[PDB]
């Protein structure tokens, strides 16, 4: 009667709650292996390794075949690019810090430290990163 007066009387599809994503999606693994982020608070270098360290060695300079061995920082122009996908976790909240590259030990439990998980004995206190579970010697599938 008002929105369309005939489009809203005959009925089409009704939309519902839209499922979310893996909310540690942007710590993708081409950094969880390439880099590692070191540093005290408010200065986090994403130190990376040398560029030429596996391809062509014979004949390259003697004292530059080793500049490939140091944990150099990546220049901040890329620090801010990669760490941009991590900030988006709660934007406009000027006091939440960015997601970290690796999962710090206290936040993993922060998921199961929630008033709703207190009743899941399994998966609490670390069960994934726990050692593999041990079962009855008769356990079988």
């Amino acid at each position: 009667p008002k929105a369309g007066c005939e489009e809203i009387t005959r009925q089409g599809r009704r939309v519902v709650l839209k499922p979310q994503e893996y909310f540690a999606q942007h710590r993708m693994q081409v950094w969880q292996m390439r880099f590692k982020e070191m540093g005290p608070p408010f200065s986090r270098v994403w130190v990376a390794l040398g560029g030429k360290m596996r391809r062509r060695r014979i004949g390259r300079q003697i004292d530059v075949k080793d500049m490939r061995y140091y944990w150099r920082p990546i220049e901040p122009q890329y620090q801010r690019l990669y760490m941009s996908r991590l900030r988006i976790k709660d934007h406009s909240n000027k006091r939440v810090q960015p997601m970290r590259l690796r999962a710090t030990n206290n936040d993993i439990g922060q998921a199961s430290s929630l008033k709703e998980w207190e009743r899941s004995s399994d998966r609490k206190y670390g069960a994934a990163l726990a050692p593999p579970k041990k079962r009855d010697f008769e356990f079988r599938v």
Binding site: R10, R13, R14, P19, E21
Partner: protein
Amino acid sequence: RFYRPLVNQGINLWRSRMGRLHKGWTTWEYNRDVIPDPRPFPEPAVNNYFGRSRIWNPIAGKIGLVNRKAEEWGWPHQRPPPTGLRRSPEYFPFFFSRYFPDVEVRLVLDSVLNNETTRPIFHIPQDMSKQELVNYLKNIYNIDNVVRIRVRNMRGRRFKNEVGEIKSLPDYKVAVVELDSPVSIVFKQ
């Protein structure tokens, strides 16, 4: 969880080139499961028309049988009469008919008024054949001289009531009987 899949962008965008014919639609979003209705939307089964070409719906409806039973025999409560009795002229609606007919042979007076007539016209229900109209006038109105009956079928009168719904009367069957010795009616003013 079912994690949001990112269908529109990313690889799932290009994967169509990478040998993937059917790019599925997001059947997790509309997931409120209540059926839409097709754009060639069907109109309801009610015969909207009220012209002279109004047609009888041949298709048998379920309810019409159920509404038949509940009056033939108390349907949900009284068990049925055995199929032998139902195939018999002693079944009540065949017994209420063979002994208590229900007919409306109304006479039109505009042809039998002060003007003498040999062909008085009737109206008989659509399902009174000729030789029954004979039997009727013979055994109920003592009319004993009917050599020829002449039968039409007329779409019942239609009109719009002051409200506005087309209130079409039931249909009938003009049957111009032809008596031998003419009949008449007097009207003193």
